[PDB]
Amino acid sequence: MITTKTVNGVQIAFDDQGHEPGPVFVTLSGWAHDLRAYDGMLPYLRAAQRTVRVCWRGHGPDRNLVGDFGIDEMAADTIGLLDALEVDSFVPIAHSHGGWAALEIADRLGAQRVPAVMILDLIMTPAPREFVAALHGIQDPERWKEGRDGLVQSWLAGTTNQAVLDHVRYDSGGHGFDMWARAGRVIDEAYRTWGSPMRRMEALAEPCAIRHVFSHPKIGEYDALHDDFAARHPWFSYRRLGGETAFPGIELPQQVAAEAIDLLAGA
Ligand SMILES: CCCCCCCc1nc2ccccc2c(O)c1O
Numbered sequence: 306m307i308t309t310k311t312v313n314g315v316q317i318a319f320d321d322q323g324h325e326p327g328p329v330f331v332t333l334s335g336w337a338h339d340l341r342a343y344d345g346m347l348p349y350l351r352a353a354q355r356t357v358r359v360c361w362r363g364h365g366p367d368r369n370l371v372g373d374f375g376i377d378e379m380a381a382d383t384i385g386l387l388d389a390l391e392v393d394s395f396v397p398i399a400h401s402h403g404g405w406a407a408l409e410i411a412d413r414l415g416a417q418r419v420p421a422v423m424i425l426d427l428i429m430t431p432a433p434r435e436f437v438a439a440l441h442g443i444q445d446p447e448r449w450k451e452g453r454d455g456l457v458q459s460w461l462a463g464t465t466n467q468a469v470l471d472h473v474r475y476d477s478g479g480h481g482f483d484m485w486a487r488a489g490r491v492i493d494e495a496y497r498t499w500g501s502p503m504r505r506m507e508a509l510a511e512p513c514a515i516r517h518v519f520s521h522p523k524i525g526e527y528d529a530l531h532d533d534f535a536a537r538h539p540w541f542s543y544r545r546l547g548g549e550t551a552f553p554g555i556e557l558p559q560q561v562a563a564e565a566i567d568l569l570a571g572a
Contacts, residue, residue: 307340309365312385313378318365319386322347323355328420328569329392330356333383333399333407336488338477339364342400345468345558346565350398353566357392359383361406368479375491379406380413396569398423398561400554402488405495408505411513420572421514423565426521426551429503429530432496443489449482452489460521460551468558469550503534512540514572518564520548520556542568 309318320340330350332343340358343350350356362382363371383406387395394417399407404424411419428436442452457473464470499505506515517531524545531543544564548556 307366309367310386310389312382312389313362315362315371315382316365316367317362317382317386318360318367319357321355321357321390323351325352325354327354327394329387329395330354330565330569331383331387331392331395331397332356332358333397333403334360334364335401335403336361336492337364337480337484338472341472341476342552343398343554346398346554346562349559349562350565353562354396354569355392357387357390357395359386361403363484370483373487375487376406376409376495379403380409383410384413394418394420396421396423396565398425398554398565399427400425401427401551402492402495404502405492405505408502408509408515411515412509416511416513419513421516421568423516423518423568424502425554425561426519427502427517428522429501429517429534430522430527431501432493437493437496440489440493444486446482446486449485453485462521462549464549464556466548466550466556469552469555472552472555503530506541507538512538514540514542514568516542516544516564516568518544518546518553518561519551520546520553521551 307320309316334342339360397407404427407422411422439452439456443449535541546553546557550556554561
């Protein structure tokens, strides 16, 4: 199934499925996992649009350590892969903090090449202090494994969803302190630099259609924040789903895919 290309000097793994006209779906995972985060969604995406699933450098089948990198390379590697394939307009679907890279891509290319972006359960507020502590915990060589187990448990809550449990237990091996600390550094620095993903979207020279889909932060002020952002920004949209986990794409693939098709249809 899975293919590779050298882009910007590094091996980018991806797969490319589907041949239907219109924008191309481009899936982007969080840190420390790969395109298996979109196995559940893939049947539904690829039936609607050509779908290219993309891994970050160092995240493909080759798990050699690569040189330090951050959002800029994530964005440039991905753009360069799509250019090598001559993908014109496309819609990123990005999980969690992959969304920082997806917004950088939309910023670099403007709203005709990237007419929409979908983000899946990314903390839209400034970083909670509890979250900042985990991001520093994962940069400490002696207890990075604890910070991971701590974040993982949050994401899962009490779920009984097998897809999500297997993904985190069995399908995300092969990373360790190098990548989890990089994630810590890059994520922390994005919140410290931009304050929040919502401020980042507002710095967009020309915002494309951006939709946030999430289950996790409990219902309440978090939705009120989204209502207000949507009321001030017609390009922004959101949907709370009824899942237990911070992996809506894996837990509720059909619903998330349907939201992605709908976002594209509107743009
Ligand atoms: C285990 C399986 C991989 C899934 C994680 C990708 C999504 C994700 N990664 C993070 C990585 C480091 C720190 C915080 C993170 C976070 O808050 C996320 O939501």
